[PDB]
Ligand SMILES: *Cc1c(COP(=O)(O)O)cnc(C)c1O
């Protein structure tokens with residue numbers, strides 16, 4: 067039965083890693099990575115995370131199953147994190163949170179939940195967006211359409227084309243928004259633009275679905291949520307798929323959550339059981355380790371004080387690199403203006419390099435980037451900065 | 463939406479739980495659990511596992527992502543447990559293993575893979591079977607049919623009725639077999655019956671799919687694989703969904719594997735690529751903690767020595783309870799013959815009690831069991847053996 071099965075195509079982020087490895091030049095650089103790296107080039111385990119893991123080693127007495135929705139404190143902590151400590155969505159018991167395997171797992175579950183218990187046929191994602199969005203939504207058998215977003219000429223948010231493309235969306239269509247640190251552009255709306263999309267969202271009858279994977283990387287844990295929180299003040303319904311991969315550096319333990327908010331307690335409870343029904347048919351119940359680690363840190367003042375500092379250092383290192391990158395490009399004679407790079411948030415950014423330029427970078431120099439010209443700013447260290455800027459200047 | 467979402471029907475096994483922890487009267491006894499309990503009535507963390515987790519704490523230096531298929535060593539250890547140390551399947555590089563979230567997660571990906579890259583439309587599961595098999599296969603769009611298995615009268619495997627209903631099955635249909643310790647029955651085919659089923663399959667064109675969740679619980683690690691291994695000797699293709707939840711007490715860490723085998727390596731490599739695309743659109747990559755613990759134990763001679771001892775003790779404790787159960791029933795006046803309980807394997811068995819008797823058993827107090835009459839022998843201790851039996855004898 068597997069005889070005529072056709073090879074699945076190679077993934078971009080994934081196909082470059084190898085070629086990089088087997089590149090085996092001398093002083094090469096990987097800017098196509100999808101993870102955080104520190105000054106030294108490694109992706110360490112947060113100290114707060116390691117203290118939490120010792121705690122668990124010493125206190126876990128069983129590995130008995132978790133409920134389908136996972137750890138309760140994990141669910142409280144995230145709700146507070148998203149909607150804020152005093153939010154009414156929480157006090158009116160209007161939101162229900164399920165622990166899932168990663169931000170991606172949260173996304174697939176919302177998809178299956180939506181595709182089987184609702185009249186949703188389409189989900190609108192930005193152009194561009196993390197590539198894996200189309201694949202998760204196509205799996206649950208939903209259509210994905212594209213809305214404008216990025217201005218390739220000016221390197222900003224073409225708010226107009228956005229709104230103008232979002233008028234084709236019908237009442238009842240799902241619209242996906244990146245909460246902060248848009249992947250891959252690094253371009254996020256302003257608070258006033260978030261408020262405008264909120265009003266437009268209820269007027270048109272759209273179902274907002276937020277993918278919140280980088281809370282804490284643009285400006286702060288709280289500032290990074292004004293957008294989502296601006297929609298939650300106005301909507302009756304909403305879905306949030308968040309992930310703790312980047313911000314707790316817990317990538318391989320699959321830690322995220324899919325939050326459902328309805329008009330009230332009875333509807334979320336009724337709607338959430340169908341969401342639990344969808345989890346049961348997929349992976350049954352979620353992996354305890356990462357989530358226990360997150361609940362433990364978020365709920366101890368000592369440990370949480372340390373995590374916030376660690377997350378702040380990551381945030382600040384990234385903001386250093388973006389400044390030092392446009393600065394070193396300038397000293398090296400950089401032909402063009404890369405200053406827009408400092409206006410964008412998070413680890414990603416389109417460098418505005420040409421597919422053929424990216425190829426030249428990888429062949430003639432050791433510089434590796436994704437064909438879209440997307441580079442991961444976290445792969446830049448003060449040490450490799452100079453040879454990197456010199457290679458890019460040589461291709462402009 | 464969400465306005466008219468109808469509630470999901472309470473899951474049977476997960477319903478008694480709350481009625482149990484609501485009862486809170488004297489010598490309550492939950493036998494509807496689906497987990498192992500020792501003589502203390504607790505589900506401990508295997509010591510071999512605690513040792514592995516400390517080693518991990520001290521040695522991990524990153525939580526960066528695992529490949530879609532997970533840890534390589536996990537994949538190879540799994541393959542040896544299933545097929546044996548020198549299997550041809552291994553030497554010919556005919557099998558590819560994906561680390562997965564739980565045995566249930568393996569079933570789901572075998573299913574999405576099968577549903578998208580193949581002509582399968584049907585999957586046959588025994589009657590009765592783990593209730594969740596219909597749900598996972600259905601959520602993938604495959605229909606599920608039932609072959610006969612249990613002899614309600616004689617408390618055995620109706621071989622003939624099984625082979626007879628299986629004749630309704632067409633070529634290119636998936637047949638699902640439980641490798642050892644049939645859930646909920648505990649009735650497994652003999653080696654001569656496995657071989658008979660292996661030969662009939664090759665000639666009818668059935669694609670076999672093994673659900674192997676209790677390796678090590680019927681007779682031994684190797685012995686429990688002889689059925690799987692009789693099939694693998696005469697098939698070009700087959701799929702195995704194994705779980706390490708029960709035999710490693712890693713219930714909540716979500717640890718399992720989906721093994722694909724094909725006629726040769728280029729096919730399996732090509733088919734596996736599509737299996738990986740299915741994972742990537744589900745949860746992306748798998749949780750490391752548990753699978754690291756398993757690979758670590760299975761790799762080190764000292765720890766594996768200890769783990770095996772720990773598995774033998776669980777296996778021997780269950781075989782002791784089946785025996786003390788049918789012995790304490792006899793001497794307590796039980797008028798029926800419960801001998802078949804000793805001939806069954808694993809944690810479960812149908813007591814052959816009517817729906818009305820389980821209800822009466824529980825209300826008239828004490829005993830909680832699944833309405834099917836299914837009972838978990840691991841929930842019995844030498845301490846509750848007498849009251850349990852008194853209560854069963856009082857209702858026959
Ligand atoms: C990283 C990311 C996710 C997923 O987080 P994971 O825990 O790695 O699955 C989802 N959406 C976006 C936009 C992301 O960047």
Ligand SMILES: *Cc1c(COP(=O)(O)O)cnc(C)c1O
Pocket residue numbers: 350563564565566567592640645673675705706707716717718
């Ligand atoms: C326990 C079990 C599974 C699943 O193991 P998990 O790791 O919990 O998913 C699958 N099939 C049967 C028959 C089982 O008993």
